[PDB]
Amino acid sequence: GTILIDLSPDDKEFQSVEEEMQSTVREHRDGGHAGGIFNRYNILKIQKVCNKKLWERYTHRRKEVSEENHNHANERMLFHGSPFVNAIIHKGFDERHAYIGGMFGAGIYFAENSSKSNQYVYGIGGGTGCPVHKDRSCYICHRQLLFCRVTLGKSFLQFSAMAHSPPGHHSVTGRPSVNGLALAEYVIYRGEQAYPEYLITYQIMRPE
Numbered sequence: 363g364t365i366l367i368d369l370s371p372d373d374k375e376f377q378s379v380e381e382e383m384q385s386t387v388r389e390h391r392d393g394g395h396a397g398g399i400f401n402r403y404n405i406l407k408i409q410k411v412c413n414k415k416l417w418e419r420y421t422h423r424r425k426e427v428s429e430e431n432h433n434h435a436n437e438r439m440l441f442h443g444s445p446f447v448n449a450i451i452h453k454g455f456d457e458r459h460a461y462i463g464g465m466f467g468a469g470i471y472f473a474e475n476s477s478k479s480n481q482y483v484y485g486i487g488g489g490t491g492c493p494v495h496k497d498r499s500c501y502i503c504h505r506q507l508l509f510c511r512v513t514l515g516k517s518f519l520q521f522s523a524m525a526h527s528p529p530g531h532h533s534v535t536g537r538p539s540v541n542g543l544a545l546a547e548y549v550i551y552r553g554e555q556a557y558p559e560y561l562i563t564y565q566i567m568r569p570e
């Protein structure tokens with residue numbers, strides 16, 4: 363049911379997605395171990411993910427959440443990196459896509475910082491790096507991230523350095539409490555609460 367529509371680099375929509383990708387790169391406390399050493403990306407392609415069934419599954423859930431939270435879905439656009447990006451765009455998010463060992467429990471994790479999601483493209487901790495060169499810092503191989511529409515609803519705030527949501531909440535927010543430059547990360551416990559709206563193909567760039 364999924365079709366992928368290429369965006370032109372001249373399209374304002376390509377440009378706004380690229381800017382969110384580039385402007386939310388940060389340095390990571392692992393010195394680049396997981397995701398590689400880079401300050402910016404070479405964006406190769408941005409595709410719109412179109413699937414009627416998956417979209418309707420998302421909007422149905424979004425209405426349920428909205429109605430449980432004074433008509434406020436608290437919808438964000440967030441990054442997701444995963445070795446399962448191909449399954450996600452065809453079948454939707456579900457429990458197979460959960461980070462069982464995440465710090466907020468077994469749920470599906472999203473990041474404000476594109477570079478945080480980049481650390482998961484090749485697996486937890488960057489796994490063994492790219493398939494071809496086994497390099498977590500590969501500057502040659504093409505990587506993919508999702509830029510996703512995510513319903514947070516009433517989100518449980520965790521100050522910090524599938525399961526169920528905490529009672530009375532629809533998500534968890536991991537607020538950074540040590541690294542002053544880190545942006546928030548978020549967990550949902552229902553696959554229906556996210557839609558994989560853009561598929562971004564890119565390389566990390568070696569700093570000069």
Ligand SMILES: O=c1[nH]c(-c2ccc(O)cc2)nc2ccccc12
Nearest residue numbers: 442443444461471472473479482547
């Ligand atoms: O983008 C993120 N992805 C993942 C992730 C972990 C395991 C897995 O099998 C698929 C994806 N974890 C994250 C944790 C924090 C922030 C972003 C992410």
Ligand SMILES: [Zn+2]
Nearest residue numbers: 492495500503
């Ligand atoms: Zn490679």
